[PDB]
Amino acid sequence: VKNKCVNFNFNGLTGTGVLTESNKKFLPFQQFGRDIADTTDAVRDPQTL
Amino acid sequence: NSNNLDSKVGGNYNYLYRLFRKSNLKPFERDISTEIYQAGSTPCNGVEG
Amino acid sequence: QCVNLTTRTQLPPAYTNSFTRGVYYPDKVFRSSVLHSTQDLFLPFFSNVTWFHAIHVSGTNGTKRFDNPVLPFNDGVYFASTEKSNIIRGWIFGTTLDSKTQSLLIVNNATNVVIKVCEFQFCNDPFLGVYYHKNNKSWMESEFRVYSSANNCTFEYVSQPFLMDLEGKQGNFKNLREFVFKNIDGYFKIYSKHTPINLVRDLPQGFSALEPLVDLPIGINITRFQTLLALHRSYLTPGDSSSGWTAGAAAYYVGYLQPRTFLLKYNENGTITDAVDC
Ligand SMILES: *[C@@H]1O[C@H](CO[C@@H]2O[C@@H](C)[C@@H](O)[C@@H](O)[C@@H]2O)[C@@H](O[C@@H]2O[C@H](CO)[C@@H](O)[C@H](O)[C@H]2NC(C)=O)[C@H](O[C@@H]2O[C@@H](C)[C@@H](O)[C@@H](O)[C@@H]2O)[C@H]1NC(C)=O
Ligand SMILES: *[C@@H]1O[C@H](CO)[C@@H](O[C@@H]2O[C@H](CO)[C@@H](O)[C@H](O)[C@H]2NC(C)=O)[C@H](O)[C@H]1NC(C)=O
Ligand SMILES: *[C@@H]1O[C@H](CO)[C@@H](O)[C@H](O)[C@H]1NC(C)=O
Ligand SMILES: *[C@@H]1O[C@H](CO)[C@@H](O)[C@H](O)[C@H]1NC(C)=O
Ligand SMILES: *[C@@H]1O[C@H](CO)[C@@H](O)[C@H](O)[C@H]1NC(C)=O
Ligand SMILES: *[C@@H]1O[C@H](CO)[C@@H](O)[C@H](O)[C@H]1NC(C)=O
Ligand SMILES: *[C@@H]1O[C@H](CO)[C@@H](O)[C@H](O)[C@H]1NC(C)=O
Numbered sequence: 001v002k003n004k005c006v007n008f009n010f011n012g013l014t015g016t017g018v019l020t021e022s023n024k025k026f027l028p029f030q031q032f033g034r035d036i037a038d039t040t041d042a043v044r045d046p047q048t049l
Numbered sequence: 050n051s052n053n054l055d056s057k058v059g060g061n062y063n064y065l066y067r068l069f070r071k072s073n074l075k076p077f078e079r080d081i082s083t084e085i086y087q088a089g090s091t092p093c094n095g096v097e098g
Numbered sequence: 099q100c101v102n103l104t105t106r107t108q109l110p111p112a113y114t115n116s117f118t119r120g121v122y123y124p125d126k127v128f129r130s131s132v133l134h135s136t137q138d139l140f141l142p143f144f145s146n147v148t149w150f151h152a153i154h155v156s157g158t159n160g161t162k163r164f165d166n167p168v169l170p171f172n173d174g175v176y177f178a179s180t181e182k183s184n185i186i187r188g189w190i191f192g193t194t195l196d197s198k199t200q201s202l203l204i205v206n207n208a209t210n211v212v213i214k215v216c217e218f219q220f221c222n223d224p225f226l227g228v229y230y231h232k233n234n235k236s237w238m239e240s241e242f243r244v245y246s247s248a249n250n251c252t253f254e255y256v257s258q259p260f261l262m263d264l265e266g267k268q269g270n271f272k273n274l275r276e277f278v279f280k281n282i283d284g285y286f287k288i289y290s291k292h293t294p295i296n297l298v299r300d301l302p303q304g305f306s307a308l309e310p311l312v313d314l315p316i317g318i319n320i321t322r323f324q325t326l327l328a329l330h331r332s333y334l335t336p337g338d339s340s341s342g343w344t345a346g347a348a349a350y351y352v353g354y355l356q357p358r359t360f361l362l363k364y365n366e367n368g369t370i371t372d373a374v375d376c
């Protein structure tokens with residue numbers, strides 16, 4: 001579910017927020033992205049990649 | 050407990066443990082050497098005594 | 099099997115300066131447009147790095163350098179390699195390079211990549227070797243003189259087959275391969291990076307973050323390592339397999355990692371483009 005405020009469980013990482021399409025290009029070994037506050041602000045979908 | 054599997058009436062001697070090591074093992078380190086340990090000041094030459 | 103090479107000229111060891119190389123991604127977390135401070139095993143900036151050559155220059159005296167010594171493995175190794183003919187074939191890691199203790203072999207057999215933790219009776223002069231045929235005008239792998247016997251092991255991995263052409267290219271170094279090897283908690287961490295580059299002699303100056311390559315569950319004691327190279331044999335340089343060889347032009351540089359705090363810069367694309375050694 002995108003563009004809506006939902007609870008999400010991505011690969012065991014639980015949280016609440018709105019998921020939107022990202023322009024970030026993750027490296028093949030990377031799964032999560034964090035900001036300067038160490039909070040998960042980007043995530044790779046385990047299925048759609 | 051695996052007494053019903055790893056125990057034998059005459060004695061199960063297929064399981065070994067390392068004794069007399071020069072230094073403590075590092076975490077997640079494996080030592081399978083069979084060199085004779087030198088406990089005293091007399092050098093050993095591959096024989097036990 | 100075990101063959102010691104001869105006719106090697108004696109030269110003093112060479113030392114160079116590592117400017118900003120050896121930086122790798124500390125973790126697998128994406129960061130963009132940030133300045134991240136992290137403490138880890140890094141190669142110090144502008145460090146004194148040992149330099150080893152592989153070259154055969156003919157003449158009345160000339161120089162025949164084939165450097166494959168046993169170097170210490172203290173806390174982590176930065177291994178840079180400038181080559182054009184794929185001279186460097188791999189490495190061996192261990193404490194006593196014999197059947198007494200287990201050792202890790204990471205080699206390229208010119209067809210597959212073999213990573214084996216096994217009890218190896220390594221040769222005093224281990225190497226690999228291709229042969230050049232005048233009629234074929236092609237180079238084929240013919241010699242594998244790394245270890246004498248393999249026994250009492252756990253770890254085996256063979257990569258998918260490939261070609262990996264063995265032609266003896268001449269000119270400038272066209273490949274720079276950087277590796278970071280660490281031995282932490284029974285895990286062999288390998289980080290890798292590749293750069294085209296174009297220069298003659300020394301290590302190129304620049305910045306290139308090394309990406310994680312492999313996490314081998316090795317679990318052995320490692321204090322020393324030796325680089326396994328590749329030599330050339332053909333209708334020229336005749337001999338009896340101990341002196342009848344020539345070394346393709348290549349260089350490799352060895353540095354040692356220390357626990358340091360680094361401030362890395364992640365650009366808008368998530369790539370580490372610069373670092374500061376505090
Ligand atoms: C470690 O290696 C020992 C020797 O292997 C033999 O010699 C090699 C050079 C090679 O030729 C190999 O093919 C040979 O099989 C293994 O064998 C044991 O060695 C001890 C001497 O230290 C001897 O007393 C045992 O009888 C002999 N056992 C066997 C089955 O060959 C070791 O095997 C294990 O360790 C033994 C202590 C014993 O528990 C045996 O049942 C085990 O399989 C090797 N140890 C390992 C692989 O952990
Ligand atoms: C890993 O191997 C090194 C070298 O083989 C060990 O260091 C040796 O330790 C012994 C005593 O334990 C000393 O007598 C030697 O002089 C040491 N040699 C070197 C080069 O340091 C080290 O102890 C081993 N580590 C483990 C956990 O077994
Ligand atoms: C299963 O996961 C893979 C990711 O590797 C993805 O490509 C594929 O579309 C997924 N299949 C389904 C039915 O979701
Ligand atoms: C290489 O030199 C070593 C010296 O320690 C020797 O033990 C070994 O037998 C030599 N290899 C040969 C002669 O093939
Ligand atoms: C590097 O170390 C060697 C000896 O280990 C020394 O001779 C050389 O001067 C050092 N390099 C620099 C730039 O100081
Ligand atoms: C290298 O080793 C692999 C497996 O160990 C083998 O399949 C391959 O043929 C070898 N390459 C040679 C002998 O050139
Ligand atoms: C030339 O190549 C063929 C196959 O690639 C091989 O059978 C032959 O032995 C090669 N020539 C020589 C002199 O080795």
Ligand SMILES: *[C@@H]1O[C@H](CO)[C@@H](O)[C@H](O)[C@H]1NC(C)=O
Nearest residue numbers: 025364365366367368369371
């Ligand atoms: C980041 O990526 C974009 C698109 O691929 C590119 O235009 C830009 O130059 C890149 N930035 C850097 C610093 O390489």
